[PDB]
Amino acid sequence: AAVQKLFPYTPRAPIRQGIYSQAVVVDRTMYISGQLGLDVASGKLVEGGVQAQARQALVNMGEILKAAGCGYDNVVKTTVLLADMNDFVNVNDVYKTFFSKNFPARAAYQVVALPRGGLVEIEAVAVLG
Amino acid sequence: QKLFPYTPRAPIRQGIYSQAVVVDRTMYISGQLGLDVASGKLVEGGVQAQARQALVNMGEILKAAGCGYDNVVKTTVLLADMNDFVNVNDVYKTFFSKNFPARAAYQVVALPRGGLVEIEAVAVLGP
Amino acid sequence: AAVQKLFPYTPRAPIRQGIYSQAVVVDRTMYISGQLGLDVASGKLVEGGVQAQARQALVNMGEILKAAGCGYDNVVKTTVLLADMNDFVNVNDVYKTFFSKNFPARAAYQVVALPRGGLVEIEAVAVLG
């Protein structure tokens, strides 16, 4: 038969309309698209560099979680894609203000480039309660 | 409750990975390259041709599990060059036209076989 | 409602306290953090290059699997992150010694840099029996 996919959407977080969904929920599992440090009000990356962008990516992720009836506690795995491996600690310090206990599994590493010239992209898997 | 669908119509690295693993209702699909099994080589024509062939390969694996593109819930698009982003998205959109997967996309240094694009995916089977 | 999350822990694999859990198990699915070729006893990457590091990364992953009551046969998907794509065969040659049949799905690619200067990092998803 068909598959019961859900597509929770919020205009408070970015999307590439017609290319990807902010998130897809199937039964208990929520796949969240890679989040960038974009401000939906401006359509541009926030200023201030990797720390500001990482914070805004996680703010964006939180709006998507909330649209599905979830919160940061629901995240079970993230991948932190960095423009510069040197930013590991500074990004971790931002990250821990969102995931402060019961931490997701994680991988973090430096890639060549991200969409929109971003300095960080964060994807996630969450599970519904 | 764990299946390993295989199709000779898509590539594999025998003894290294399965094309896909179906466990419960979730299907994990290996990173697909723009390889043509008939020639044993990457298709000619550049990143658009390779991205299309990768997605054709993914479709053959999906069909081997009784699925189609609608079952895909998440993909990761790995590019050799971020300058190919628009051209790859245009090909990508011809396979996923609504109810789109979640997605991550980024440029890496290099891919197996010298490919210009690799696409991995998670799909979910319907009841 | 809250989602029920379990965090396998082994003293035989690394952990970044306050940043990530070695793995998260939710409703039979286990997300394993990216593993480097780190020797917990020495606090350093092992001697011997990418093949020694890949072996240690997989040994570490196996100890985390054991903490969840799992083994290598429970792994359903891995991602192999390389410092150098020319190491592909060498890493495959170590990787295949840990799986004999019913192999995980896999993705592999060369990144710019990994934490600790590692030459290879392997993340995984597993499913409990």
Residue numbers in the entry:
A (entry chain B), C (entry chain C): 2 to 130
B (entry chain A): 5 to 131
Provide excerpts from the study.
The two SsRidA-2 trimers are virtually identical (r.m.s.d. values 0.45 Å/380 Cα) and also SsRidA-2 monomers are all well superposable (r.m.s.d. values in the 0.15–0.26 Å range over the whole Cα chain). However, SsRidA-2 is the only ortholog with a Pro residue in position 9 in place of Ile or Val in the other analysed sequences. Residue 9 is part of strand β1 and a substitution of Val or Ile, which are highly compatible with a β-structure, with Pro, a β-breaker, results in a shorter and less regular β1 strand in SsRidA-2 compared to SsRidA-1. In SsRidA-2 this intermolecular two-strand β-sheet is not present and both regions are partially disordered in the structure. Secondly, the shortening of β1strand by Pro9 reduces the H-bond network in the central β sheet likely decreasing the stability of the monomeric fold. Crucially, residues 16–18 are typically small and hydrophobic in RidA primary structures, while Arg and Gln are present in position 17 and 18, respectively, in SsRidA-2. This confers very different chemical properties to SsRidA-2 binding pocket compared to SsRidA-1. On the other hand, SsRidA-2 has a positive charge in position 17 and, under our experimental conditions, showed a strong preference for the IA derived from L-Glu, while the lack of activity on the IA derived from L-Asp cannot be explained. On the other hand, SsRidA-2 showed a more canonical denaturation curve revealing a Tm of 65 °C.
